[PDB]
Every structure is written in C-alpha cells, then in structure tokens.
C-alpha cells in the first residue's frame, strides 16, 4: 500500500506499520479500554506514545497528574533503590520489556492487562491518621479515587523490586510475574498479600 520512494530509505517496515494507523507500533491503545466506573477519568486509555516521553509539566496544575500517561505515571515509582534515582532511560529501554514478557505470558492485549492491574489493585476502604490522642482510630474513610490509583502504582513497586534482589530474575520477570498474578488479583503478588492487609484493617475502627 504505497512505498515512500524518497539515498535515504527511511523504513518500509516502520513507514506498512505506522503510516496504514496511531500508537506505539508494537502494541495496538485501538479497541482497548477500561472496565470499571470510578479510576474512568483518572487514568489516561492513552494519548499515543507513535514512545513509552512527555517534558512533563504535571505538578504545578493541582490535578493534571490525572492527562498523565499510566505508562509514562509508571516508568513513574520504578524511579528508585536511591541509586538509579534519575534514570528514566533504564526505567524505558524495563517497561518496554514488561509489555512483551504480560504479551508473551496469557496471550493477551498486554497494554490492557497493564490497565487491569489498575482497576483491582486499588485500595478503596482505607484508613487515616484522626490527631485522635495518644491512641485512637484510623477514622476509616474510601480515599477521592484520585489518591486510589496513586497507591495502585506506588504498592506494586515495593514488592516486584525485592523479587531482582539476590535474584535470578531480571522487573522486565517479576513485575510480568506480578501483574498477570495481580489483576486474577491472586495473592502470589504483593497488593491483593497489602491492598486487601488496609481493606482488612478498616473493616473493624470502622
């Protein structure tokens, strides 16, 4: 379907791939959606990144954290463990990996199972520190859904991190070993074995 014939052959593989089409031309963001009502509105499915980097003026305006592409509040977290602190290009050479080890293992739309590790991974029934005295109760109150997803990424990063940690497994195989088992969530993961562990510290205090 029409190869440009410009000396400089700038691809006919990444020309039929991204002319016919938008979006990162490995994963098609194209009939992939969200299945809950609450975390629509507060989790971009995608404005087109044709890669997984925007300057990023996301915290001036008290909200736009919203407008922030999910994929690039993720690579965002990983950003740590302190020593890397700064490295985004190590963090996209790692999640540009992650989306191939979900596609490969399940056989899914993996950018969706990326999204289903969001709404499922969110703590709703959550506590707060009432002050209150020397001792009081964590009046149990359901976060906005704003906060929720702040946690739903935050959680996931503090347990697929120890898994490489004296580990044969290179976060690419533990991250996708968390999201497949965190959406099926299961409890072989770390959210649905803390998310539940905060529901479950509240259900009393309440």
């Amino acid at each position: 379907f029409t190869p440009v014939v410009l000396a400089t052959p700038i691809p006919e593989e990444v020309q039929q791939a991204q002319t016919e089409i938008k979006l990162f031309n490995k994963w098609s963001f194209e009939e992939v959606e969200v299945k809950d009502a609450s975390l629509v509105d507060y989790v971009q499915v995608a404005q087109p990144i044709f890669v997984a980097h925007t300057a990023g003026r996301y915290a001036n305006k008290r909200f736009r954290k919203a407008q922030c592409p999910i994929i690039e509040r993720l690579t965002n977290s990983l950003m740590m463990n302190g020593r890397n602190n700064g490295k985004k290009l190590k963090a996209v050479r790692i999640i540009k990996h992650t989306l191939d080890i979900i596609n490969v293992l399940t056989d899914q739309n993996p950018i969706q199972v990326v999204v289903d590790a969001i709404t499922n991974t969110g703590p709703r029934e959550d506590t707060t520190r009432v002050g209150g005295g020397g001792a009081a109760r964590r009046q149990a109150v359901d976060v906005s859904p704003l906060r929720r997803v702040n946690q739903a990424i935050a959680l996931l990063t503090i347990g697929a991190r120890e898994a490489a940690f004296r580990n044969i497994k290179t976060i690419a195989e533990t991250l996708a070993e968390e999201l497949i088992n965190a959406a099926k969530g299961s409890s072989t993961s770390y959210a649905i074995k803390k998310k539940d562990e905060l529901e479950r510290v509240a259900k009393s205090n309440r």
Partner: protein, 140 residues
C-alpha cells in the same frame, strides 16, 4: 533561485539548522541521517513529526540538519521542533497558508513542545547546601 527556506531549533541548551531546499528525498542529522538515530531507544522521538502527515511531503523537502551544545537527550526536541518549525516555515514562506492551518491542527494535538519549545529554567544555587532547594544539616 534557491527555493532556500529555513530555520533553527532550540530544550534547556542547544540548537538545529533546517537549509530546507529543493532536491531528491533526504534528512541528514549531525552528518548521519535521523535510519541512523543516535541514542537508539528514544529513537522514536524524532520518528513522529515524515509518515504525524505524508516520508509525500518530505520527498520534495530537503533537510541537512546541523547538530550542536547540551548527556544525550537534550537536543532531541531542540531536532523535532526542527522538522515541523520548518513544516511551517516550508508551509509558510513557500507552501501556501491554509497548509499551515489544515497543520499546527495536526502538530497541535500532542499539544506539546514539536512546535513551542520548553520554558522551565534551572534554579540558581545557594549559599548553604547542595540539587537546588537544599539547606545544610541541623544541631543542638
């Protein structure tokens, strides 16, 4: 004659020079065309703008982009601005005027840099403490 018109590029440090003339195909960056990107993961940064539009348009439009300033990712927007910049400097001086309006409603959508370079500064440093808003240790 030559028909040439033409521009600069600017993101936090350096420049490019799009010499957008009349030839046959080419898109030379640093003495090395764009298939040959440079920090080859970001590689897709510049690949959006040839296709964000017809790889159709840029057959006509020849860009020898020299790239100085500004560590590797600085200039990446500087050479992005400049292929669009002039995208409308060709589509302003040369190719009409609604071809700058059909564009900029394509190119305005990622509503990003692309067209308008970044604003943000590095903050000056001070006395006492080390990157910027840091104050030295405390005592008692």
């Amino acid at each position: 004659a030559v028909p040439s018109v033409q521009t600069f590029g600017k993101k936090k440090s350096a420049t490019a020079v799009a010499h957008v003339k009349a030839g046959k195909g080419l898109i030379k960056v640093n003495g090395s065309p764009i298939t040959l990107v440079e920090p080859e993961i970001l590689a897709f940064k510049v690949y959006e703008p040839l296709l964000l539009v017809g790889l159709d348009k840029f057959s006509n439009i020849d860009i020898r982009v020299r790239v100085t300033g500004g560590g590797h990712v600085s200039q990446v927007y500087a050479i992005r601005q400049a292929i669009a910049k002039g995208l409308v400097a060709y589509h302003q001086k040369y190719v009409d005027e609604q071809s700058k309006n059909e564009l900029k409603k394509a190119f305005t959508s990622y509503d990003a840099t692309l067209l308008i370079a970044d604003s943000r500064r590095p903050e000056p440093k001070k006395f006492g403490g080390k990157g910027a808003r840091s104050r030295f240790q405390k005592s008692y």
